[PDB]
Symmetry: D2
């Protein structure tokens, strides 16, 4: 037998960093969860019990904190690229670093209509994520994403004209609830290294904001023919607004809300045009995915 | 042996309701999770296999949907009271109903600076809850709460002057991070029945809003001497603003963020006044509770 | 306003302890999660910012580790009682300690049909728990429990003869699936203090084992008329086998598995006597509780 | 823009099936969670709102139940292959089906030392999984796995001789606790279609059993030089015992248990040879992966 692939490192490293403006007294906090996995000439640790090739995962953890101390942690695309580059440059035998970062929301509180200098609220479990793969001699590949954005519209969703055969019981509909948890990923063109990533720094936050805005507006305004059709419209617009993105991927559950027939009870009318009370279904759920790239 | 206490019913009943304004086209959604447990002269179902006394839990589920169809579901204090009253009035042998409701956030989306008629976002896992106990001949007891409100302040929290003995290693501090998940409950004076609950309907939403506002403002503005001292200030203010509340209870975890000494690495300074990077601790956590009532 | 009730301490303290037999080389591990909350003359920490009355929660954490180092951690009833007694004896102004312990399973592995000296498996998320309340001048109250024991029987459960009215759609049945997660609690007679708890030490593990055995056998053998009837039989037997128990409480979800009518598809028969494929329902669920004491 | 990849279907479909032996009265239950995603000539549903190409996800759900009714559901490798083949054969424009199955444990209860005919216990959250990809003209690729197998050994694990530099604080050790949650996947050689999968049916359960046994024995018996070295030994043995496996992948967290220095308290000795009480760490954790194939 032979080692075909191997990677190892530290997962679930929670990091918080505060920035304090001495002039204004304003403080800004960042909190993330980081995973770093390394690859390289490490097969002998598996096959020969040769630990001399292992950068201990505890050391990887230390490196994450030290790197956060000495560098900006925002945008996460930049931080991930600095962190990944560190490992391939520092260690001759390490040839790839894979860095995943999940950014947690700490939103500045408004008290009496003004922004508070040092108090924050977690407004939702929505995350902003990055995956950065730094591969020696092959540059830096970055996938940025948002996840956990949960939305619902109560009308202006339809689903009719699908294939009907002997396995089909679903009725066509011209008015239904549509609700999903959005997972959207945009993949950047390959960057040659850290200098190039630095040169594009302003684009990272702007593109995240654009992706979020396009998702929300399209969802709210589309008279949706299906999840498939609506998500394609979102992806199309993101690609149009940022030329440095190569592909956009959406993965969307269709979280069903079922009508409840109450007619058995005193002829109560609660279906079709009369539907007011529905039963949200925890499972099963549709799952719809697509990856959109350029012609 | 004898049955000393017994209650039974249906838990985890998910309900969604939509209200459609025909005039304006504006739609408003409510989503809740409901639990109803009944008590009464039901001991023989346990001791003699006498099912004749059992209102099936499936029927309780049906009743929740039917009641939501025929009544407003907001404020949840009113809905819970209608639902609980139903069971004690409908069934001679049922003498208490215990209704718990968890309200999930569906916040209207703003698209291009205007409120959208029918699209909603889940902004945070914060809940608004009620517990309603309807007891035949003893009225209606209502406890209202908010939970899952997660906040952090990066300075203006202190903790010094605590007991020091041979079990103590904790250093006194004049500047630390304070972060918690707020669980706050206000208990209403007993109501004689549904007519009295109806008479106070406007107070329910207003008091929820006040409790939230007082919590957030006090947390942000208090130069906190301890979690204990800050939470007492919150409870005091809520009791002052609503005379129909008898007690306020807060239950607050102290979610610790630890300094990381980096001095072992090139004399890097990251403690005390130089602390910028911290390690959030998933566990253990302080847990601080208090119930405040009137003199 | 006044402080009506207050308690504070440390939650989610994870503890592992190993015992090493030097003679046989056999090692035995225990892992628990502990919560300790104190009450006493501590109101001034809330009302006057007087921290002098606070035993820091960090010190409580230290005390848990020190106590585990110097005492047996099994049975958990004994450990909880030692830990709770410590606080009320050590601190003049602390008058009650509330200790909750969750014991996690680490079951010795059998390799090649023999017990391994130092390797363990987590066989299920079933827990053994204790709640110990040590109140100065009022002794020690102990509630022991098992939770997270998930079982299913595929036949020999019935449910018919329940109340039918205009809210009822449920069909009577003489053969259904019954599945639940068992939560069972037995409450001990009050103990005068640690000496008395020590005197009964062998009864704690034996009663846990009896409670588990009675639960499993009764569930498997009862031709169940309802969850209510079956759970009463369990509680009755536990009370009969251990005179030092005052009450037994069961709390049982009824986790529903629904028939799926497939007759719309080529007349396929999958209901009643022909039912083979079912849809487990994640929610809602019945919830049935009872507390059984002595005549 | 263009659709580069697309797949859609139904996730989280819970299925239970019972087999009843009329002769012996013995009943056997299977419970699974199934996900089916399809690919094919479906781009127009995204780009042109053409639903005519969509097999509704609700129909996919129906198909899962119908298929379970008419076929064995064990071993899951066979069931997944039948289910996947169905879609590519039934629908001309569907060219790949991706089926994931998670099998939940329902273990027959022993009551009074004998196997009960119809009562079952969930002994642990360990799962047996399959991923089956059925691709028209390219056969059937099957990856089988076990996951959620949580183990701990209290000694006979070492970690020394790793790289030490200015980022390293970890001390070498010759005796530590090792605990992990095992995720192991074995990938079968490609099968030409359902006939070939049927021909190997007995190998599926046997190989699962072998993989489990090898994992447990190796973990318990290896005087481990590292997670890397121990996991390689496991993978090597599995490949040796089943020639129809091409690769074995392990993904193992290193769940840390830290010594607690108690010497600050009355010189109490709890480190090194004197370590008895440890603090399990919820995070961060090492994560070690490897894929082993044939020379
Ligand atoms: O077994 C281990 N492997 C590793 O790579 C490692 N790094 N720190 N501790 C460790 N233990
Ligand atoms: O065992 C049961 N008890 C109940 O109270 C009930 N209600 N619906 N189904 C039921 N099954
Ligand atoms: O605010 C606090 N209250 C407490 O009781 C405590 N104990 N340790 N740290 C603490 N912080
Ligand atoms: O938007 C939808 N897309 C689908 O593929 C589907 N299938 N059932 N319902 C559906 N809704
Ligand atoms: Cl769907
Ligand atoms: Cl605390
Ligand atoms: Cl029920
Ligand atoms: Cl590790
Ligand atoms: Na390198
Ligand atoms: Na009544
Ligand atoms: Na005392
Ligand atoms: Na096909």
């Amino acid at each position: 037998s032979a080692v075909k692939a191997a990677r190892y490192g530290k997962d679930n490293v929670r990091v918080y960093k505060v920035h304090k403006d001495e002039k204004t007294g304003v403080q800004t906090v960042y909190e993330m969860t980081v995973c770093v996995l390394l690859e390289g000439e490490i097969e002998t640790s598996y096959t020969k019990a040769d630990n001399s090739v292992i950068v201990a995962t505890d050391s990887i953890k230390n490196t994450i904190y030290i790197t956060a101390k000495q560098n900006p942690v925002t945008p996460p695309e930049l931080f991930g690229s600095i962190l990944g580059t560190h490992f391939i440059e520092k260690y001759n035998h390490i040839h790839a670093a894979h860095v995943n970062i999940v950014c947690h929301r700490w939103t500045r509180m408004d008290i009496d209509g003004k922004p508070h200098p040092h108090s924050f609220i977690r407004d939702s479990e929505e995350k902003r994520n990055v995956q950065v793969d730094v591969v020696e001699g092959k540059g830096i590949d970055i996938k940025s994403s948002l996840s956990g954005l949960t939305v619902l519209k109560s009308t202006n969703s339809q689903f009719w004209g699908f294939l009907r055969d002997e396995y089909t019981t679903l009725k066509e509909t011209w008015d239904r609830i549509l609700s999903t948890d959005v997972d959207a990923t945009w993949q950047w063109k390959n960057f040659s290294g850290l200098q190039e990533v630095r040169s594009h720094v302003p684009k990272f936050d702007a593109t995240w904001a654009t992706a979020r805005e396009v998702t929300l507006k399209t969802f709210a305004e589309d008279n949706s023919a299906s999840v498939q059709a609506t998500m394609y419209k979102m992806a199309e617009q993101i690609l149009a607004r940022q030329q440095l993105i190569e592909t956009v991927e959406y993965s969307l559950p269709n979280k069903h809300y079922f009508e409840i027939d109450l007619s058995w009870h005193k002829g109560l009318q609660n279906t079709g045009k009369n539907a007011e009370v529905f039963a949200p279904q925890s499972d099963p759920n549709g799952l719809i995915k697509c990856t959109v790239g350029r012609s």
